[PDB]
Amino acid sequence: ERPTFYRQELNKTIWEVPERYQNLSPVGSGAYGSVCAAFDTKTGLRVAVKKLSRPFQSIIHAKRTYRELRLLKHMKHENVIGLLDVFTPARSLEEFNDVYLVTHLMGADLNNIVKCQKLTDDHVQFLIYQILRGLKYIHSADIIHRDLKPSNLAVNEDCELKILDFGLARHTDDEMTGYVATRWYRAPEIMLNWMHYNQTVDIWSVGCIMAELLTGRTLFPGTDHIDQLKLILRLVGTPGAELLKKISSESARNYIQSLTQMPKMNFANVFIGANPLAVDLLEKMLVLDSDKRITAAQALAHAYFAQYHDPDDEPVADPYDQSFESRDLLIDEWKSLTYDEVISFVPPPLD
Numbered sequence: 001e002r003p004t005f006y007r008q009e010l011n012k013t014i015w016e017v018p019e020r021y022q023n024l025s026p027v028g029s030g031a032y033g034s035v036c037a038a039f040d041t042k043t044g045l046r047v048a049v050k051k052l053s054r055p056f057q058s059i060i061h062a063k064r065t066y067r068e069l070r071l072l073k074h075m076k077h078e079n080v081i082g083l084l085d086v087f088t089p090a091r092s093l094e095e096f097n098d099v100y101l102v103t104h105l106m107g108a109d110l111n112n113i114v115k116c117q118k119l120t121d122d123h124v125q126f127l128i129y130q131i132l133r134g135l136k137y138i139h140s141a142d143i144i145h146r147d148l149k150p151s152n153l154a155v156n157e158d159c160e161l162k163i164l165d166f167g168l169a170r171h172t173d174d175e176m177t178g179y180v181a182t183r184w185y186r187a188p189e190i191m192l193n194w195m196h197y198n199q200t201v202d203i204w205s206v207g208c209i210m211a212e213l214l215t216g217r218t219l220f221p222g223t224d225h226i227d228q229l230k231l232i233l234r235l236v237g238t239p240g241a242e243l244l245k246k247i248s249s250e251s252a253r254n255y256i257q258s259l260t261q262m263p264k265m266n267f268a269n270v271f272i273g274a275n276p277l278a279v280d281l282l283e284k285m286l287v288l289d290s291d292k293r294i295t296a297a298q299a300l301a302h303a304y305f306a307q308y309h310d311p312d313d314e315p316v317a318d319p320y321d322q323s324f325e326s327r328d329l330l331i332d333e334w335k336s337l338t339y340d341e342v343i344s345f346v347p348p349p350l351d
C-alpha cells in the first residue's frame, strides 16, 4: 500500500517525497515553507512541491495548514491555482507531522511582464479577463483572495494567467509598512480597517492591477497608509455621507472628515489615450464605496471583454463549506482533520 518514498537532504531541509517526483531543486523558502522544483513522472508536468515548515506547531498553524489544504482541494479552475497532489511520508496519524503540496510550477508572474512598460490593450483585456474569470469562480464559493497583486498572478508565455498565493492562511502583520507594494493594491476600507471587508476588496485590487497594465505605473504607490489614502481619495474623491455612515470606527470617520472634500477625478484625463471601454471599467471597479463596486461576474459581461466573454465558459464553484473557521479545536484536532483530507485526496484526471 502507498507509493515508495525516498529521502534527500536539500539545503538543510530533509525532503521525503514519492519517487514519482524527480530532479528536486530548491527554488525558494520562507514563512510558507520550502518550495522545490521537480519533474512529476506521472503527469509529465514540471511541478512545485511545498514542504510546510512547522505545520502543527500551534493551533494557529494547525488551522492555517488545514485552511490551505481545504482551499487548494476545492479550487478547480484554469485561472486558479490547483492541487495536483498532497502527501505525507507518515505511515499513520501518530507519525503524521509533515505536509507536502504539489501544483504546476509557475515561472513568471504578471510582474515579470508589466515592469517592461505599458502593455497593449489586447493583452490587457486578456490578462484582466482571466483574472476576473478566476475571481468570479473564487467568489461564487464565498472565498475572498484578499491579496491580489501582480506577484500573485502566475503568467505564461501565451499570456495565460493563474491566481495563487491566496490569503486564507497568513495574517498580514507589520508587512504593510512604508513604501511597500504589499499594500499598494489593498482597498482603503481594509487598509485602514474602516469596516469588515467584502469580496469587492478583490475587485478593487484588479482595478489597481488593470490601471498599472495600461499606464505601466503603480496606481497608488503611497509611502505609508495615510499617504496612500490621500492618493486614492484624490482620484476617487472623498467619502460622502452615504459612505461615512458605513464606517464603524468613530476615529476613522473623525479622521476622514478632517480632510478637505474632493470630487472624483475624470478617469479619461488620468488614463490618457486609453480605450474608453477600459476607462469605463476602471471607473466601475475603483469605486470608494465597496457596496457600489462592480462584481467579477458583471465585469466579465462588460463590453471591454467582448472579444473573450463567453457566458457558458465562465464556470462557478461547487458550494464551499468553511464552517470550520468557527470551529475551536486543539492542535491535535486540526492535525487529525488535516490527515483525513491528505489521506482522502483524489488526483485530478489527466489528458
Ligand SMILES: Nc1nccc(-c2c(-c3ccc(F)cc3)ncn2C2CCNCC2)n1
Pocket: 027, 028, 032, 035, 048, 049, 050, 072, 082, 083, 084, 101, 102, 103, 104, 105, 106, 107, 151, 164, 165
Ligand atoms: N514556484 C512556485 N510555483 C508554483 C507555486 C509556488 C508556491 C506555493 C505552492 C502552493 C501549492 C502547492 F501545491 C505547491 C507550492 N506556495 C508558494 N509559492 C510561491 C508563489 C510565488 N511567490 C513565492 C512563493 N511556487
